[PDB]
Design a binder for this molecule. Structure first.
Ligand SMILES: CCCCCCCCCCCCCCCCCC(=O)OC[C@H](COP(=O)(O)OCCN)OC(=O)CCCCCCCCCCCCCCCCC
Ligand SMILES: NC(=O)C1=CN([C@@H]2O[C@H](COP(=O)(O)OP(=O)(O)OC[C@H]3O[C@@H](n4cnc5c(N)ncnc54)[C@H](OP(=O)(O)O)[C@@H]3O)[C@@H](O)[C@H]2O)C=CC1
Ligand SMILES: CCCCCCCCCCC[C@H](O)CC(=O)SCCNC(=O)CCNC(=O)[C@H](O)C(C)(C)COP(=O)(O)O
Ligand SMILES: COC1=C(OC)C(=O)C(CC=C(C)C)=C(C)C1=O
Ligand code: SF4
Ligand code: SF4
Ligand code: SF4
Ligand SMILES: [Zn+2]
Lengths: 112, 83, 84, 172, 116, 42, 145, 339, 114, 198, 385
């Protein structure tokens, strides 16, 4: 339908509902290998779920967009695909671990 | 010689500067122009001196012309006031 | 001030009314020496009106995910001129 | 609010080829420049009709003098402590009247920025920044003004300065 | 990773300071003293590292003060003796630490001047 | 007193484009050309 | 203090007197803080200074014009927070932001009093005391200033 | 203020004011650069047009260099130039004799007058520059004249320094160049094929550093000097060294000085500037000098710079493109002489 | 004490880089003289290179030698390319600057500064 | 004379600061919403690429643009330089500051991978302060002279440098020269000694 | 390939670009712009100067936009002090900010053309710019680097005749825009030189930190005057002119529209400017009035201290961005309690844009690069700082 998503690069994607379901569903999985209680898994699975929840609750694109509160769906996708890449990247950097090293003393006192 | 001296000694090599040239020196010395002014007689013990102006003159200070022995001189205008 | 023919030359060639919008200031200009102006100036304790001292040192700080702020409302095409 | 800026029947197709082949659209520009040789040039006769200025115009510095004839500068050092280009050196003494005046004053006019932070800080209206702007020089030394190229300078434009001070004092 | 080194961090070869301004120059870590002319003690609380005073001469043409000491207007401000000695050693300058001089407590009483 | 908008507003300025569409049409344009160009042949 | 003024009335003025060739008392500046009177009486034992008159008319000075001649005299300058009485030689040669301040020692006398030499553009403009609890505790001699 | 009060460099001062008269040409632009970098005032008397004195304005600092117009015909121009100086330097000298001035004037009469006023004004030093191997009856109109003057200078203002430099090489020279220029006209028509005549050449900076050191050296008073330079080279070899370094073909076809004298005459006739002339021709071929006993650059403090080193800078222009990029080690090696 | 390595772990390891730069510079000096029409001789320049690589020859903190190489390499890049003109490169030779004397009597005799 | 401010923001952003601190506990050392209503997440230097990637590519925090990368130099602190990255979210109309600490000899990673805007800013931080960025394509002087020695914005570098330039006729080139200034820069000790009541 | 950098000294290098280029025959293989040719050290010098005596550093960062650069600093110093400018001052800053956007765009559109080869548009508009300078000269005193938008307000009130004269200029300026409009918008020659040259895709523009008309030209919706409003822009109505093809022409068309939209904002500011004073009335931040300092002691003390020492802004740090005509201009001012700043990182819309030149000008010939620099509106003062 939509002739052109405003942004220059993002090109109109037919089957928005489909592309999304796949990207969102893949993500809901990559999060699985994350430690049980890792904020990322706990929060990103809270978001991806709500969007997959609407991606399948509403079949009109323009409508869908308002719900996902993103830009053109061609964007909601661009983002869904990047979170997946962060999710893969996060599972390696293991951000959930305890702090690497506390700041040296007085490394954050501005009126010095 | 400027109102503040500055006259170069004959030997001073710092005199070449003015050769084929001259010396910018103001002929109107304020040491004398202010002396060529009438002591402002007043009735009151103390007097003001806005610098002959409001916002176009100097900050306003009150001078104590209390002793005829001395004519108060506003530190800004150098105007002597004769009680 | 130009011969009407010459100026109709510039109106016809330009395609636009040109006596109206002059790039030269004849009487359009405000004259100088505007009359002098008079610019506009209790419980006025500075301790109540302290912008400088009002600021304080930076604050250092099941659950639901929170965005930095509510998503930006998308703008809408201009009513007067949607496309130019 | 956002606005898009850049977003066939034979009638249209011929019209397009009548504006590409028998160029008709570069002609709407040639008539556009023909519309200007017949207008009055804006050029002012420069040396004889100098352009317009304002009483606020900041140019060559000058040291005003009290009408009486007493220099207004009382060597506060409230005008090099603000001069951002670090241009002013005003070494002073008691002048042997007991009064307080400069023995030294200076601007290096090759460092000054004509910002007027010296005319608005002076609590006495001594240093001003006059409406000169024809004081170019063939040498570097003629721009390092001393107290006597600023005081007789101010002994020159005082008829022309005071009108502009009196004209803008209220707004300041 | 975590290689071990056994020396001060001599960054003198990374600073870029001409040798003669890193060799013959003595920093003087000190907590500035109060301006007797005022009684504010807010300018005597942080340790400063100022450099030696070299030639301040006169420009022959205008009589201004001229100088060739690039590190003349330099007054680095630290927050403790420890952090100033560290910086000077870090940059290869010689230091002359001066201990702080806080006024000792002097007991003051209003009535005392009424005794006889 | 203080420079302030003339009471009742300054007035309306126009800002939108006015590049004025105009011109002969194509069919007409060409027909003068060829008509000037057959006459050049006769 | 306050951003503005509400004193729309007339100011007072006192009469400049001569306390010596070292102290310039432009005492219309005085905030009647009686530091001078005390120093003159508790550090220097010269009780020549004193308050005269009551009401707003109180004038802090020497009732008869007798110069304040004593060593330790110049300290009054440093101790009067107001610039009512200040130094006459260093009258108007400088202004403090410019003065570069180098901390050094007194060589005029053998007490070795600590002092700060205030230099501008390379000539010394004033020497004022810097505090050493043991040697000169905030005071310097009339000679070494 | 003869007390230097500053770190060496511009904006310092070494406290020696100076009148360097010939500071419009070749040697004086370097003297002002050293006296100048030495931060000493320099009252540069110029009879030229200001457009040609600008190149001097940056070789100094604010106020260091002062200019004023002087014409040799009239004094008071010499007088006011030397009025506030303590040092005086004489560099006046012209190869040709313009219709208005003879070797008489530019080398004797004038230096005399300058020195006259110099002593009159009280200047301590009258550094004067007469040519090396330049004595009376030296069979060249100028050199002879030059020495005559050396006396006049000594007589009027005794206790004067007199430098007698050897041929001076360096950029914008008329020594290496004259030889280099031969490329344009035929080939080097050297006399004696360039052999039998030896020349010691010294860099302009070496002479300039010497004059500056002399102005400030106490023992230099009343001392003549010869700035010979490091190596003595036969003329044929030096023209061959100019070539090869010039990277243009060399042909030292010979001819006699009587003919050559006649040849330059015509070149001298040129109204603007003789490309060469009898006097020049003579001072090139016949002129040859062996220094014997005169304090030198090293004595005054300069290590004479060999011509082997700084010859790129003055002949890298005379090469055609495609050779311009040629480096030094490539240049045809030279060789020195004793004779 | 422990310190992260910038690029090399042991001084020896790093020196490997220091030599891989010396060589580079050495093999470049000839090129520069010709390209930038400099006047100094290949030998003369190559001397300078050693001097510098030598001036820094006393630090033992690998991290510092790991850092001077980089700065060092950067200076080649510019010089290898002609990003630097003659003026820039020739500045390594203090041509105008009069070398300051060091003898005490030679300094006492001039300038109040040490 | 007291800023018109919205408390909604302080809270909303504070809440995001806790969100980021929970999502990345390993690298964030301190998070604080200043009273200017702006947010600052202070991260260990090792967290430079992780923390910025999470912000560039997270649905609940998209911070697509790098406003700037700069390094304050507090000489006292052991780790003097304090690299600061200011980022903007076009989607949520909010901005964040991630600041980490780097010493003279300890390099921090380069975010050119995360944002290509940083390719130039990181070169300027190296030229100005001397911080080195690991695996950074083409790090080299952006602003200083080709032969400049020393990092200029360091607090320990003299305002006016050590070298100046002039044209020397004798050598016909623009030669450097130890700095001699005709009027030293009067350094004004303007700083009151009576502190303000907080 | 062939390394022929654009000219450091060039008739069209915008002053000081070197832009070493690799010439693969006619086309340019790669560009490596060598900026630094105008790095005066602005950020170093500010640390040694008090907050008032540093304002001037700012009007000299992007000399085409004078008063908007200042408006950033002024907003940054105000936020650190927690003081806000008086209502009239805020309208005056928006009035002067829009006059600067018209003058920056007249600078950018007309100079782009002379680089392309169109010479007359520059002359017609530059006379219209001298009229606008006169407005700066008749309010500040200078035609440039006015130093008028100071912390707390403007330095002085508008002269008694300025708003009438701004109406007369704005009344007739619109014809001058489309006169340039007819000259360049439809010409075969301009569209071919500008259309489809330096296309930048939307995500790439955000990633490269373009943040300006370069961001909006590609269709991204962001102005910073409607997203994060400053001053009183929240009370003025305008339409952002976003783009669709993110190319030179669409970017040109956007710049011509913003000039038109700015006339709409200038129209509102003249119609609705409030009676009031132009600078905050706290004398501890904005100097006291000339009459007050000469009659009341508290004002003399406040004038003496403010001019000699300074505001002494409370310790903190802020990044404040305003939509400068080029793009987002931001100052990261770190402040100790002292009167003089500690750091002032000037984010220059332009450091990011010039970085994009190599990506944007790929597969393009030597002539296209001249258009690519022209469409970034880069002035090297902001980039070099
Ligand atoms: C049926 C009868 C029998 C058959 C009769 C013959 C058949 C019909 C012939 C019809 C001819 C129509 C006109 C054809 C000649 C005109 C030139 C032409 O063909 O146009 C080429 C070019 C078009 O430009 P563009 O839009 O880029 O098109 C290419 C797109 N890839 O145009 C250009 O862009 C050139 C622009 C160059 C700059 C021009 C600047 C303006 C010049 C104004 C000149 C004014 C004076 C002209 C007259 C001079 C007389 C001496
Ligand atoms: N290789 C050499 O050049 C050698 C030179 N010398 C001696 O050193 C001195 C300097 O040599 P150099 O500088 O090359 O000579 P120049 O030909 O360069 O002339 C020297 C200066 O004298 C000025 N001058 C010439 N004629 C007159 C005149 N009639 N009146 C006033 N001024 C005049 C010239 O300026 P203007 O343009 O105004 O005439 C010129 O700047 C010479 O006197 C020469 O005898 C000695 C040995 C070798
Ligand atoms: C005009 C044309 C030539 C230009 C002239 C200069 C061009 C060269 C340019 O400066 C590049 C450079 O010098 S960059 C080298 C700096 N220095 C280092 O990189 C480390 C060296 N020093 C060490 O690593 C240690 O101190 C140690 C003692 C262990 C090694 O010493 P050593 O190997 O055993 O000698
Ligand atoms: C915008 O950048 C540019 C300048 O700076 C404002 C110029 O001065 C110039 C040169 C100015 C003229 C009038 C040729 C050019 C070409 C330029 O592109
Ligand atoms: S000029 Fe005005 S400000 Fe500068 S010193 Fe003289 S009086 Fe004080
Ligand atoms: S104008 Fe600005 S710069 Fe020029 S002197 Fe007055 S203050 Fe210093
Ligand atoms: S100390 Fe200064 S102020 Fe206090 S009373 Fe004595 S004089 Fe007046
Ligand atoms: Zn008065």
């Amino acid at each position: 339908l939509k002739k052109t998503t405003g942004l220059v690069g993002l090109a109109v994607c037919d089957t928005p509902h489909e592309r999304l379901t796949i990207l969102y569903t893949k993500t809901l999985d990559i999060l699985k290998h994350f430690p049980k209680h890792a904020a990322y898994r706990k929060y990103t699975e809270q978001i991806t779920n709500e969007k997959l929840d609407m991606v399948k609750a509403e079949p009109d694109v323009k409508k869908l967009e308002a719900l996902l509160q993103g830009g053109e769906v061609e964007e909601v996708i661009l983002q869904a695909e990047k979170e997946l890449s962060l999710a893969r990247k996060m599972l390696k950097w293991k951000p959930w671990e305890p702090l690497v090293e506390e700041p040296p003393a007085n490394q954050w006192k501005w009126p010095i | 010689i400027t109102h503040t001296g500055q006259v170069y000694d004959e030997k001073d090599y710092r005199r070449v500067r003015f050769v084929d040239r001259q010396k910018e020196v103001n002929e109107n010395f304020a040491i004398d122009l202010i002396a060529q002014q009438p002591v402002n007689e007043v009735e009151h013990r103390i007097i003001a001196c806005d610098g002959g102006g409001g916002a176009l003159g100097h900050p306003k200070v009150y001078i104590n012309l209390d002793k005829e022995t001395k004519t108060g001189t506003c530190g800004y205008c150098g105007l002597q006031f004769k009680q | 001030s130009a011969t009407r023919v010459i100026q109709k030359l510039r109106n016809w060639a330009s395609g636009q009314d040109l006596q109206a919008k002059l790039q030269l200031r004849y009487q359009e200009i405000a004259k100088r020496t505007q009359p002098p102006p008079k610019l506009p100036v209790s419980n006025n304790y500075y301790c109540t009106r302290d912008g400088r001292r009002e600021v304080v040192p930076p604050s250092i700080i099941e659950k639901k995910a929170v965005t930095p702020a509510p998503p930006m409302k998308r703008w809408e095409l201009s009513k007067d001129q949607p496309y130019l | 609010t956002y606005k898009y800026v850049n977003k066939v029947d034979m009638k249209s197709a011929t019209d397009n080829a009548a504006r590409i082949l028998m160029w008709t659209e570069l002609i709407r520009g040639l008539g556009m420049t023909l519309s200007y040789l017949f207008r009055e040039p804006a050029t002012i006769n420069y040396p004889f009709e100098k352009g317009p200025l304002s009483p606020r115009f900041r140019g060559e510095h000058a040291l005003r003098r009290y009408p009486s004839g007493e220099e207004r500068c009382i060597a506060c050092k409230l005008c090099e402590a603000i001069c951002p280009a670090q241009a002013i050196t005003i070494e002073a003494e008691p002048r042997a009247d007991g009064s307080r005046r400069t023995t030294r004053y200076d601007i290096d006019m090759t460092k000054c920025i004509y910002c007027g932070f010296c005319q608005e800080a002076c609590p006495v209206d001594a240093i001003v920044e006059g409406p000169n702007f024809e004081f170019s020089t063939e040498t570097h030394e003629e721009l390092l003004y001393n107290k006597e190229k600023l005081l007789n300078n101010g002994d020159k434009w005082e008829a022309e300065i005071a009108a502009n001070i009196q004209a803008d004092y209220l707004y300041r | 990773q975590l290689i071990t080194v056994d020396e001060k961090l001599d960054i003198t070869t990374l600073t870029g300071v001409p040798e003669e301004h890193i060799k013959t120059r003595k920093v003087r870590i000190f907590v500035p003293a109060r301006n007797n002319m005022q009684s504010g003690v807010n300018n005597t609380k942080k340790w400063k590292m100022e450099f030696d005073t070299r030639e301040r001469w006169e420009n022959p043409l205008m009589g201004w003060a001229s100088t060739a000491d690039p590190l003349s207007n330099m007054v680095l401000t630290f927050s403790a003796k420890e952090d100033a000695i560290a910086f000077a050693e870090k940059n290869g300058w010689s230091y002359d630490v001066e201990e702080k001089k806080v006024p000792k407590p002097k007991s003051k009483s209003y009535g005392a001047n009424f005794s006889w | 007193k203080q420079d302030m908008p003339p009471p009742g507003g300054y007035g309306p300025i126009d800002y939108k484009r006015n590049l004025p569409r105009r011109g002969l049409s194509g069919y007409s344009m060409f027909a003068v050309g060829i008509g000037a160009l057959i006459f050049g042949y006769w | 203090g306050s951003d503005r003024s509400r004193f729309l009335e007339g100011k007072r003025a006192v009469e400049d007197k001569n306390i010596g060739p070292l102290v310039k008392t432009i005492m219309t500046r005085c905030i009647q803080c009686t530091r001078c009177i005390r120093f003159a009486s508790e550090i220097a034992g010269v009780d020549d200074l004193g308050t005269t008159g009551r009401g707003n008319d109180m004038q802090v000075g020497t009732y008869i014009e007798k110069m304040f001649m004593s060593e330790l005299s110049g300290n009054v300058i440093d101790i009067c927070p107001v610039g009512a009485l200040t130094s006459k030689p260093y009258a108007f040669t400088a202004r403090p932001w410019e003065t570069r301040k180098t901390e050094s020692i007194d060589v005029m006398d053998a007490v070795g009093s600590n002092i700060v030499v205030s230099t501008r553009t390379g000539e010394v403009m004033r020497i004022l005391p810097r505090m050493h609890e043991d040697i000169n505790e905030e005071w310097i001699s009339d000679k070494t200033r | 203020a003869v007390i230097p009060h500053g770190k060496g460099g511009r904006s310092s001062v070494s406290g020696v004011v100076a009148t360097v008269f010939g500071a419009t040409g070749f040697l004086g632009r370097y003297v002002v650069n050293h006296l100048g970098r030495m931060g000493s005032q320099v009252i540069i008397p110029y009879r030229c047009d200001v457009y040609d004195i600008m190149h001097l304005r940056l070789m100094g600092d604010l106020g260091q260099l002062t200019f004023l117009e002087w014409d040799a015909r009239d004094k008071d121009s010499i007088r006011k130039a030397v009025q506030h100086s303590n040092v005086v330097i004489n560099l006046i000298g012209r190869e040709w004799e313009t219709r208005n001035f003879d070797f008489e004037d530019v080398f004797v009469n004038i230096p005399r007058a300058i020195a006259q006023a110099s002593k009159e004004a009280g200047v301590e030093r009258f550094i004067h520059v007469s040519h090396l191997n330049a004595s009376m009856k030296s069979s060249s109109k100028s050199l002879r004249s030059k020495a005559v003057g050396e006396k006049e200078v000594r007589s009027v203002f005794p206790e004067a320094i007199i430098i007698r430099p050897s041929d001076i090489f360096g950029r914008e020279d008329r020594f290496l160049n004259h030889f280099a220029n031969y490329r344009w006209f035929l080939a080097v028509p050297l006399v004696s094929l360039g052999f039998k005549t030896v020349k010691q050449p010294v860099y302009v900076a070496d002479v300039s550093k010497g004059i500056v050191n002399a102005t400030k050296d106490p023992d230099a008073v009343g001392k003549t000097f010869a700035f010979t330079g490091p190596n003595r080279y036969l003329l044929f070899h030096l023209v061959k060294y100019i070539f090869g370094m010039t990277h243009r073909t060399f042909i030292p076809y010979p001819l006699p000085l009587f003919v050559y004298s006649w040849i330059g005459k015509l070149f001298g006739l040129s109204p603007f500037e003789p490309w060469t002339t009898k006097d020049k021709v003579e001072r090139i071929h016949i002129s040859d000098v062996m220094p014997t006993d005169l304090p030198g650059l090293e004595d005054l403090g300069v290590q004479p710079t060999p011509l082997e080193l700084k010859s790129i800078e003055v002949l890298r222009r005379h090469r055609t493109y495609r050779w311009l990029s040629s480096e030094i080690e490539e240049t045809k090696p030279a060789k020195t002489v004793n004779y | 004490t422990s310190v992260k390595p910038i690029f090399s772990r042991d001084l020896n390891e790093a020196k490997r880089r220091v030599r891989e730069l010396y060589r580079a510079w050495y093999r470049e000096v000839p090129n520069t003289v010709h390209l930038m029409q400099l006047d100094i001789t290949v030998k003369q320049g190559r001397d300078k290179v050693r001097e510098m690589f030598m001036k820094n020859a006393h630090v033992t903190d690998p991290r510092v030698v790991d850092l001077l190489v980089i700065k060092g390499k950067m200076e080649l890049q510019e010089t290898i390319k002609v990003w630097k003109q003659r003026t820039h490169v020739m500045r390594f030779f203090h041509e105008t600057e009069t070398p300051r004397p060091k003898d005490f009597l030679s300094k006492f005799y001039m300038g109040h500064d040490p | 004379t007291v800023r018109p401010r919205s408390d909604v923001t302080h809270k909303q952003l504070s809440a995001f600061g806790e969100y980021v601190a929970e999502i990345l506990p390993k690298y964030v050392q301190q998070v604080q919403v200043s009273c200017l209503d702006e947010l600052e997440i202070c991260i260990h230097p090792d967290g430079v690429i992780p923390t910025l990637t999470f912000l560039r590519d997270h649905t609940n925090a998209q911070f697509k643009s790098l406003a700037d990368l700069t390094a304050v130099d507090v000489p006292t602190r052991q780790n003097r330089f304090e690299i600061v990255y200011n980022l903007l979210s076009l989607r949520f109309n909010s901005r964040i500051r991630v600041k980490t600490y780097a010493d003279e000899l300890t390099p921090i990673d380069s975010i050119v991978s995360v944002h290509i805007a940083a390719n130039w800013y990181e070169r300027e931080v190296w030229d100005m302060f001397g911080v080195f960025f690991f695996n950074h394509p083409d790090l080299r002087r952006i602003l200083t002279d080709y032969g400049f020695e020393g990092h200029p914005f360091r607090k320990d570098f003299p305002l006016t440098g050590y070298v100046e330039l002039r044209y020397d006729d004798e050598v016909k080139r623009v030669v450097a020269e130890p700095v001699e200034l005709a009027q030293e820069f009067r350094k004004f000790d303007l700083n009151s000694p009576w502190e303000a009541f907080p | 390939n062939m390394t022929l950098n654009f000219g450091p000294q060039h008739p069209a290098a915008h002053g000081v670009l070197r832009l070493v280029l690799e010439l693969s025959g006619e086309m340019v293989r790669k560009c490596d712009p060598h900026i630094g040719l105008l790095h005066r050290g602005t950020e170093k010098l500010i640390e040694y100067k008090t907050y008032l005596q540093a304002l001037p550093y700012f009007d000299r960062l992007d000399y085409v936009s004078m008063m908007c650069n200042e408006q950033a600093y002024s907003i940054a110093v105000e936020k650190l002090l927690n003081i806000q400018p008086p209502p009239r001052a805020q309208w005056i800053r928006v009035l002067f900010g829009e006059i600067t956007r018209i003058l920056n765009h007249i600078m950018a559109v007309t100079t782009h053309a002379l680089d392309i080869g169109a010479m007359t548009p520059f002359f017609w508009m530059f006379e219209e710019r001298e009229k606008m300078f006169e407005f700066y000269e008749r309010v500040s005193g200078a035609r440039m680097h006015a130093a008028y938008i100071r912390p707390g307000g403007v330095h002085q009130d508008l002269p008694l005749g300025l708003l009438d004269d701004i109406y007369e200029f704005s009344k007739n300026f619109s014809l001058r825009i489309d006169e340039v409009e007819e000259m360049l918008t439809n010409n075969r020659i301009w569209r071919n030189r500008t259309v489809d040259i330096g296309v930048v895709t939307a995500e790439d523009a955000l990633n490269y930190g373009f943040s300006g008309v370069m961001l909006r030209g590609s269709g991204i919706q962001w102005d910073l005057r409607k997203t994060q409003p400053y001053d009183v822009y929240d009370q003025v109505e305008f339409d952002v002119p976003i783009g669709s093809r993110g190319d030179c022409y669409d970017r040109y068309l956007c710049r011509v529209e913003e000039m038109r939209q700015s006339l709409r904002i200038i129209e509102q500011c003249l119609n609705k400017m409030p009676p009031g004073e132009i600078k905050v009335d706290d004398a501890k931040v904005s100097p006291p009035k000339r009459a007050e300092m000469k009659t009341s002691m508290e004002s003399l003390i406040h004038h003496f201290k403010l001019y000699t020492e300074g505001y002494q802004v409370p310790p903190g740090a802020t990044y404040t961005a305003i939509e400068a005509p080029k793009g987002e201009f931001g100052v990261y001012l770190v402040s100790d309690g002292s009167s003089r700043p500690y750091r002032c990182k000037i984010k220059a819309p332009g450091f990011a844009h010039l970085a994009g030149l190599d990506k944007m000008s790929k597969g393009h010939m030597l002539a296209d690069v001249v258009a690519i620099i022209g469409t970034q509106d880069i002035v090297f003062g902001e980039i070099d700082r």
